[PDB]
Motif scaffolding. Structure first.
Motif, PDB file in Angstrom:
ATOM      1  N   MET A 266      -5.169   0.147   1.902  1.00  0.00           N
ATOM      2  CA  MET A 266      -5.483  -1.028   1.051  1.00  0.00           C
ATOM      3  C   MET A 266      -4.720  -0.945  -0.248  1.00  0.00           C
ATOM      4  SD  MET A 266      -9.257   0.605   0.368  1.00  0.00           S
ATOM      5  CE  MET A 266      -9.236   2.174  -0.701  1.00  0.00           C
ATOM      6  N   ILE A 267      -4.683  -2.074  -1.012  1.00  0.00           N
ATOM      7  CA  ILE A 267      -3.774  -2.167  -2.180  1.00  0.00           C
ATOM      8  C   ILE A 267      -4.546  -1.909  -3.462  1.00  0.00           C
ATOM      9  CG2 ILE A 267      -1.930  -3.658  -3.382  1.00  0.00           C
ATOM     10  CD1 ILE A 267      -1.384  -4.990  -0.578  1.00  0.00           C
ATOM     11  N   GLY A 268      -4.185  -0.942  -4.184  1.00  0.00           N
ATOM     12  CA  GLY A 268      -4.780  -0.753  -5.499  1.00  0.00           C
ATOM     13  C   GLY A 268      -3.939  -1.376  -6.616  1.00  0.00           C
TER      14      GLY A 268
ATOM     15  N   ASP B 274       0.882  -1.237   0.000  1.00  0.00           N
ATOM     16  CA  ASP B 274       0.000   0.000   0.000  1.00  0.00           C
ATOM     17  C   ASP B 274       0.927   1.300   0.000  1.00  0.00           C
ATOM     18  OD1 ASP B 274      -2.012   1.562   2.523  1.00  0.00           O
ATOM     19  OD2 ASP B 274      -2.050   1.915   0.487  1.00  0.00           O
TER      20      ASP B 274
ATOM     21  N   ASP C 201       0.450   4.112  -1.382  1.00  0.00           N
ATOM     22  CA  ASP C 201      -0.243   5.397  -1.176  1.00  0.00           C
ATOM     23  C   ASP C 201      -0.878   5.536   0.201  1.00  0.00           C
ATOM     24  OD1 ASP C 201      -2.527   3.826  -1.535  1.00  0.00           O
ATOM     25  OD2 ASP C 201      -3.008   4.609  -3.456  1.00  0.00           O
ATOM     26  N   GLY C 202      -0.679   4.600   1.020  1.00  0.00           N
ATOM     27  CA  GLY C 202      -0.965   4.822   2.403  1.00  0.00           C
ATOM     28  C   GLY C 202      -2.458   4.784   2.745  1.00  0.00           C
ATOM     29  N   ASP C 203      -3.311   4.265   1.891  1.00  0.00           N
ATOM     30  CA  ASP C 203      -4.762   4.436   2.209  1.00  0.00           C
ATOM     31  C   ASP C 203      -5.275   3.182   2.955  1.00  0.00           C
ATOM     32  OD1 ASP C 203      -4.787   2.697   0.131  1.00  0.00           O
ATOM     33  OD2 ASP C 203      -6.199   3.679  -1.065  1.00  0.00           O
TER      34      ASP C 203
ATOM     35  N   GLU D 199      -0.259   0.049  -7.573  1.00  0.00           N
ATOM     36  CA  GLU D 199       0.655  -0.221  -6.507  1.00  0.00           C
ATOM     37  C   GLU D 199       0.989  -1.674  -6.257  1.00  0.00           C
ATOM     38  OE1 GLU D 199      -2.216   0.934  -2.667  1.00  0.00           O
ATOM     39  OE2 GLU D 199      -0.547   2.173  -3.240  1.00  0.00           O
TER      40      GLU D 199
END
Ligand SMILES: [Ca+2]
Ligand SMILES: [Mg+2]
Ligand SMILES: [Mg+2]
Length: 107
Positions: A95-97, A89, A91-93, A100
């Motif tokens: 969860m994994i997009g 993750d 971008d730190g949100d 990423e």
């Protein structure tokens, strides 16, 4: 199965992390054969591991990561889960997009 993995490499990658706290996601990706696939197979795998089709890998899905390769596979421990999530993750949100995840596997 999917992402064109070989059954013998899935079977040997689950045997290598069968013990709790022996999982390292970079080692598993390399053993199972996915680190060298094309991005199209990398994406297929991502969308299998995204079990509710949200377009992210949430932390609860990530905890069940190995049960996408074998229904009776163990859950990941919290430690294993946390490591994988902080590397995937970027971008730190929390969860994994899909971009990423790909960047993590090919890094
Ligand atoms: Ca999801
Ligand atoms: Mg869900
Ligand atoms: Mg994220």
């Amino acid at each position: 199965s999917f992402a064109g993995l070989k059954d013998a490499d899935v079977a040997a990658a689950l045997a290598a992390c069968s013990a709790a706290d022996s999982f390292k996601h970079k080692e598993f990706f390399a053993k199972v054969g996915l680190a060298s696939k094309s991005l199209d197979d990398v994406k297929k795998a991502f969308y299998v591991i995204d079990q509710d089709k949200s377009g992210f890998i949430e932390e609860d899905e990530l905890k069940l990561f190995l049960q996408n390769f074998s229904p009776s596979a163990r859950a990941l421990t919290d430690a294993e889960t946390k490591a994988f999530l902080a590397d995937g993750d970027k971008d730190g949100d929390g969860m994994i997009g899909v971009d990423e995840f790909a960047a993590m596997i090919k890094a």
